[PDB]
Amino acid sequence: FVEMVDNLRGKSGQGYYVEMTVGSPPQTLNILVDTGSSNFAVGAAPHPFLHRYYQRQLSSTYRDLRKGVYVPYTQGKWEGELGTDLVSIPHGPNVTVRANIAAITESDKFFINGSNWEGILGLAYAEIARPDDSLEPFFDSLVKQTHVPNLFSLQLCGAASVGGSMIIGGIDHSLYTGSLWYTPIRREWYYEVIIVRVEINGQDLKMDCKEYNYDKSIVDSGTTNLRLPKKVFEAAVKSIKAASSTEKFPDGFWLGEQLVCWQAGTTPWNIFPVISLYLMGEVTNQSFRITILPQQYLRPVEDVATSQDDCYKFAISQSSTGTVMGAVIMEGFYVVFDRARKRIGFAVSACHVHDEFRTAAVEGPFVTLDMEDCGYN
Numbered sequence: 001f002v003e004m005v006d007n008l009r010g011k012s013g014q015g016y017y018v019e020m021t022v023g024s025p026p027q028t029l030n031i032l033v034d035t036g037s038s039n040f041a042v043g044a045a046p047h048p049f050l051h052r053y054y055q056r057q058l059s060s061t062y063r064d065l066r067k068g069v070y071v072p073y074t075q076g077k078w079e080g081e082l083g084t085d086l087v088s089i090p091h092g093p094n095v096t097v098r099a100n101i102a103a104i105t106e107s108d109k110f111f112i113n114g115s116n117w118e119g120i121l122g123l124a125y126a127e128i129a130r131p132d133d134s135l136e137p138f139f140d141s142l143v144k145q146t147h148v149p150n151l152f153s154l155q156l157c158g159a160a161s162v163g164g165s166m167i168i169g170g171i172d173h174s175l176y177t178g179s180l181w182y183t184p185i186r187r188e189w190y191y192e193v194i195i196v197r198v199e200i201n202g203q204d205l206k207m208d209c210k211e212y213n214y215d216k217s218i219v220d221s222g223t224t225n226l227r228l229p230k231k232v233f234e235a236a237v238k239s240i241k242a243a244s245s246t247e248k249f250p251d252g253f254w255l256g257e258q259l260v261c262w263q264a265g266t267t268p269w270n271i272f273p274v275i276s277l278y279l280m281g282e283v284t285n286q287s288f289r290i291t292i293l294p295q296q297y298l299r300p301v302e303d304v305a306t307s308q309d310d311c312y313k314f315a316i317s318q319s320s321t322g323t324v325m326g327a328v329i330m331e332g333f334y335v336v337f338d339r340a341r342k343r344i345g346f347a348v349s350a351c352h353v354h355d356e357f358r359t360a361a362v363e364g365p366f367v368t369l370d371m372e373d374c375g376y377n
């Protein structure tokens with residue numbers, strides 16, 4: 001699996017992309033890796049933000065499905081024309097599959113100005129595919145047409161340029177330390193999991209655990225932040241705020257409405273607490289926990305044109321859509337999307353960013369009762 005190591009690039013807050021080829025002869029595109037959606041969709045027109053786009057006219061293996069897709073979201077949208085064509089991943093398995101492609105022909109606040117990707121690879125399940133679950137997702141097609149085993153894994157490193165590895169069809173042991181711990185995929189739509197307990201600096205929030213998963217908890221490489229349900233967020237921040245009394249900050253900061261700054265090399269990591277999420281284990285009444293550092297949830301914004309020092313953003317935020325374990329979580333861990341066994345494994349990432357004092361951890365087993373009551377129905 002050494003061919004796939006380091007096959008992911010990106011810029012902070014702009015996601016992780018992999019090189020892909022579409023059509024015959026192959027057209028190289030950089031494609032956002034997204035475990036929180038299930039469409040393979042590529043820019044297919046000269047939007048001014050795009051370095052490159054899919055030119056169906058140049059492809060002998062293109063086939064129109066003569067159906068459109070309209071994909072609205074709160075701040076924007078994309079739409080496109082459905083088709084299929086031959087797809088390959090240069091630094092992935094040595095195969096070529098016929099996949100669905102949404103050729104993107106109009107969009108609003110989708111593509112990022114200054115980014116180096118031109119499409120999105122939705123790695124989640126058909127249930128949430130658009131326009132409906134009849135549109136076979138890429139990975140489903142990959143597995144159905146090849147002998148590539150039904151799993152993939154992600155090491156998102158986050159260092160400006162981030163990097164990482166998407167290991168398709170397996171697991172690379174060099175990408176992590178200690179052991180993998182698995183949590184069940186509750187339902188195959190998003191990569192949905194159940195959080196059974198939350199601690200900040202070891203002290204737990206003492207919240208009905210159903211609040212942690214109202215109405216979903218998901219693993220999502222397409223989101224930057226740790227997103228927590230409102231009631232869990234206010235509780236989490238309240239405790240994070242108290243753990244961090246040594247120094248004071250505006251309320252806007254905790255709402256990601258402002259950023260905070262220190263002098264270069266003078267950021268006080270240790271005034272900020274670790275965050276622990278306990279996940280439902282593979283066995284009745286058994287859990288494990290993952291622990292992240294502030295280096296994960298205070299993410300550096302050097303991007304500031306109106307400043308020149310160590311400024312960071314608070315990378316935890318409220319959500320109406322449930323818990324989202326985004327890059328804030330995923331950058332601590334090697335993450336194994338074990339589709340064959342309906343489970344996600346977490347291990348400590350060989351590449352995560354830590355100090356000499358504290359470290360990202362994956363620990364078990366723990367005893368936690370009533371773990372299925374934590375799930376929202």
Ligand SMILES: Nc1ncccc1NCc1cc(-c2ccc3cc[nH]c3c2)ccc1OCc1ccccn1
Pocket residue numbers: 013014015016034035036037038039041071072073110111112120122130220221222223224
């Ligand atoms: N991963 C994820 N999580 C929550 C909601 C949506 C989602 N993925 C889809 C997505 C991604 C971006 C997005 C744009 C830019 C960047 C940069 C880093 N991450 C993103 C995500 C913008 C909109 C969006 O919704 C439209 C959609 C729906 C279904 C299938 C495909 N698309």
